[PDB]
Design a protein around this ligand. Structure first.
Ligand SMILES: [Zn+2]
Lengths: 73, 121
């Protein structure tokens, strides 16, 4: 060997380990009524209306199926 | 033995992988037909875990099991959160608030005993 200068530009950007968020499972809350659901789910063959949908800018995700389910209004 | 045997119905439930422990998990689990027996704290803080899981298990159809018990730190040892150390004193664990059950891993007479107290008093 000759040397190790570690020449390359410094790009140490080891990521965020999905930062612990605050209280979750915000379906909706209803004063003396039954709660509807924000973040529409999915008409799948497996997912039994338990998985929500990300609300992005002009698309809706899945999370566990990583497939967009958006349809026109 | 006055209604603190819910540990043993939970403990045989865990060995057949039937506890959707955790507020996120339980809420997902009992928003389907998986809700078979539910256990709640009296109140931990701020009253809204108390509101939220109760409204989901108070749906307008048959699926309304609900059992109301004391603070969460005991309850995690009442469920399975491993602090055995082969029976050693060390508690390495935390306490859950809401445990919802599927399929209860058993045929227990305490399982026979428990629903009757849930039904008749
Ligand atoms: Zn899915």
């Amino acid at each position: 060997r000759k040397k190790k200068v570690y020449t390359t530009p410094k790009k140490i950007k080891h990521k965020h380990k999905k930062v612990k968020l605050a209280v979750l499972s915000y379906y909706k809350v209803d004063a003396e009524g039954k709660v509807t659901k924000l973040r529409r789910e999915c008409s799948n063959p497996t997912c039994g209306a338990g998985v929500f949908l990300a609300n992005h800018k002009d698309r809706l995700y899945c999370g566990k199926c990583h497939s967009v389910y958006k349809v026109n209004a | 033995t006055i209604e603190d045997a819910l540990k043993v119905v939970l403990r045989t439930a865990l060995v057949h992988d039937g506890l959707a422990r955790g507020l996120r998990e339980s809420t997902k689990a009992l928003t389907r037909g998986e809700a078979l027996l539910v256990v709640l704290v009296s109140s931990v803080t701020e009253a809204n875990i108390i509101k939220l899981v109760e409204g989901l298990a108070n749906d307008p159809e048959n699926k309304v099991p609900l059992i109301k018990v004391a603070d969460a730190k005991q309850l995690g040892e009442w469920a399975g959160l491993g602090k055995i150390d082969r029976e050693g004193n060390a508690r390495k664990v935390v306490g859950a608030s809401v445990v919802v059950v599927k399929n209860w891993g058993a045929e227990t007479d305490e399982l026979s005993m428990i629903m009757e107290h849930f039904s008749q008093q």
